[PDB]
């Protein structure tokens, strides 16, 4: 049986600052989100 390792890909956030808005856009880089931090 082959071994393919887990836990790959980064987490990037896109937000305006604290004097503007609290909304955060989150970029998942390189990982397909059709399959899918606390």
């Amino acid at each position: 049986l082959d071994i393919t390792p887990c836990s790959f890909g980064g987490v990037s956030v896109i937000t305006p600052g604290t004097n503007t808005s609290n909304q955060v856009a989150v970029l998942y880089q390189g990982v397909n989100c059709t399959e899918v931090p606390t």
Binding site: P5, C6, F8, G10
Partner: protein, 49 residues
Amino acid sequence: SMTKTSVDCTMYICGDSTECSNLLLQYGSFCTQLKRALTGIAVEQDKNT
């Protein structure tokens, strides 16, 4: 411009063990310097275009 790369210290140094992540924090900000250095390359490669 050239190829923009990013190197994580979690998957490269450690073999996904609990002992390697606990002893990485004793060395501190050594991987804080390397992630800010590869970020500052990738800002200036977009300014070259």
